[PDB]
Symmetry: C2
Subunit: 340 residues, 2 copies
Amino acid sequence: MRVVVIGAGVIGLSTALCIHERYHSVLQPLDIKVYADRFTPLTTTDVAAGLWQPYLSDPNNPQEADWSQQTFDYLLSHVHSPNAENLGLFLISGYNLFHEAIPDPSWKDTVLGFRKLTPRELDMFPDYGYGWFHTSLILEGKNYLQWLTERLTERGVKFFQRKVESFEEVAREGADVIVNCTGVWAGALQRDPLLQPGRGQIMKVDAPWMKHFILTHDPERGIYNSPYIIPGTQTVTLGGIFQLGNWSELNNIQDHNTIWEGCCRLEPTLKNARIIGERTGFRPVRPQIRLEREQLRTGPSNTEVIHNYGHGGYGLTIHWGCALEAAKLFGRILEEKKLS
Amino acid sequence: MRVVVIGAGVIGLSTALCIHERYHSVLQPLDIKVYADRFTPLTTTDVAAGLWQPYLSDPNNPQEADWSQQTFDYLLSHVHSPNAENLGLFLISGYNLFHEAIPDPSWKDTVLGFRKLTPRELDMFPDYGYGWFHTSLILEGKNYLQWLTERLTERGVKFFQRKVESFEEVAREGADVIVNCTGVWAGALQRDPLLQPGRGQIMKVDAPWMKHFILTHDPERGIYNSPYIIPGTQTVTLGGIFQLGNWSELNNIQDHNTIWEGCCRLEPTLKNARIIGERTGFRPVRPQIRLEREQLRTGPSNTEVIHNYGHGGYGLTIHWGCALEAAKLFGRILEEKKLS
Ligand SMILES: Cc1cc2nc3c(=O)[nH]c(=O)nc-3n(C[C@H](O)[C@H](O)[C@H](O)COP(=O)(O)OP(=O)(O)OC[C@H]3O[C@@H](n4cnc5c(N)ncnc54)[C@H](O)[C@@H]3O)c2cc1C
Ligand SMILES: Cc1cc2nc3c(=O)[nH]c(=O)nc-3n(C[C@H](O)[C@H](O)[C@H](O)COP(=O)(O)OP(=O)(O)OC[C@H]3O[C@@H](n4cnc5c(N)ncnc54)[C@H](O)[C@@H]3O)c2cc1C
Ligand SMILES: O=C(O)c1cc(CCc2ccc(Cl)cc2)c[nH]1
Ligand SMILES: O=C(O)c1cc(CCc2ccc(Cl)cc2)c[nH]1
């Protein structure tokens, strides 16, 4: 069985791992291959802090709340594990700030010790009069990518640096199943009017005193386009940028100033923190995640395509549930191709 | 007016600063000097993680509770200022675990977002049946001492290496007022068998993924004699040793093993953490703090002693309230000798 996963970001590597662990049997000899244009240090997955937190407003698709919850429960059970440190996995508590009273989120019982902020706590944030506190998890993109790659490497998965021009090219070069995990660049392989680059920029800062996440929200600004402070393992993530339709890979001075002004006003201690570096990424923006099997009529016999893209700002928060569902879609192919 | 502060730990340095802040302008030649046999990294203060948390057993002492509350307010005021980094001061959330049910502490309204631990959080600690969760403060001993030193230095306070033999030694060179902040060694200057060493030992570990303090409690081991994990700015503190009457300043291997095994059982990710260092410190154990005035006769010149010692395990937690009460006692000397 020949399988080609296109892309080496969070989605591709986890779908490749999930499929390989659930379907690579002696009864199912899988030849899995990873095809990517950009790898482990230079993807949009690396730019992500890795904080587990779904949308403030409920999605149009209810399968997504299940996939996000399923990712949390999985990560939590491995949070005290001997491998936690390599994945970049750890528990964290923090603040959710608002200007108005908001209903409690769907994930209020998934996270640990959810409650509303007390007045004396709210008194610490002059600009916000309402908010939450809970304990979540972090899965840093870069460390997790480094973990997945190495775990795949010891499983025979061969990685290849190349820009894939079309599905047919991969199919004709002997592919049976094409797992499409191209993120925002899925439009280059197949026209998707529901796809747009959710451009984001961040800063990496040396602020070790920071033990909590601090996320502010504003409907005027929109989702992920308002200041956020996310402490990592070696550095703190300074964010708050979202530009729908922007394809500029370079960092810009206005977004730098926006992030810095916003986070230093949120936490004045930050004014003394050292800028380690800055990065730019593209959230694969869609009304909902595209996670389905598509038949491609390549002459007589058809080559199968599993699309797994359009994860927006929640690709780490949801990855595992999407991986298991894509694995479920991979199982249906095996049985429909007389192999189960 | 000649003042000699004996002690360069949290007690001496904070007391020197308070007497200066309140009295530099009333007395024409206010002369303050600091005498100490150990400084900056070599004091008991330096051995302390600096978590704000009163003694496990309720006093029931309103005055002692006011000294603790006064310190929290004074530190919570600095916590968001762009100077906080220099004090070694930051907010930190965490767990306090017990095998059995217990009443809420009198400080439940001093700390931020105090609550009982949920059943899903208790599942993370199989050895414990009940516990608390709250947000408090860390004021790192070494870092704080450096800030107090630089505040004192700018105010022209001078530092001298001197192992004082008697109060009479210092009264003879011209001291009008001696401030006794000798911690656990106070008995050498004036007999006090109530003051005993509470031998403690800690491990300094590199685990920057740790964002929560974890403290365990066992009445059969006694206070401070149960595993505790307190993340600092650049390093994590591992401890849990209390040895009443032990004067050994050497790091013990059995205590090293007991600290390591005890903390790795509580938090298994700690197994991969790299041990940076270890220290031993003697808590100035006394059933109650010795904070009072005492007149000396030596010389035709009057010589007054202000005692401020015996803060056990909670020196950083209580210091500010004690430093202000010692400044007020200094003020009582001026309104008695007719100099204010
Ligand atoms: C600033 C910022 C901060 C964020 N923080 C968080 C967070 O804290 N938590 C969270 O849950 N999510 C966060 N996100 C969202 C998250 O980063 C994404 O949702 C997720 O990484 C995208 O996964 P991917 O694997 O689809 O995309 P990518 O990581 O972009 O990887 C796509 C892969 O497809 C390959 N590819 C594309 N086209 C081709 C082609 N023709 N041929 C070969 N290979 C191709 C690429 O080269 C690449 O290896 C953040 C995003 C941004 C922008
Ligand atoms: C392992 C451990 C962990 C701890 N963690 C915390 C914590 O998280 N939070 C908290 O609130 N507390 C903590 N503590 C408690 C805290 O360290 C003390 O209660 C506080 O340090 C004592 O202050 P001091 O100024 O009385 O002691 P010291 O720092 O010991 O200073 C005494 C000073 O007197 C000088 N001196 C003594 N005798 C003479 C003499 N004859 N001549 C000259 N100078 C003299 C010394 O050299 C020294 O400079 C901890 C203690 C230990 C041991
Ligand atoms: O910048 C992003 O794309 C991003 C950040 C996060 C974690 C912080 C956060 C802020 C806001 C909201 Cl609504 C949810 C989560 C996830 N994606
Ligand atoms: O060992 C000490 O003396 C010590 C530890 C701490 C911080 C953790 C802690 C443990 C136990 C209690 Cl009761 C309160 C606080 C301060 N001093």
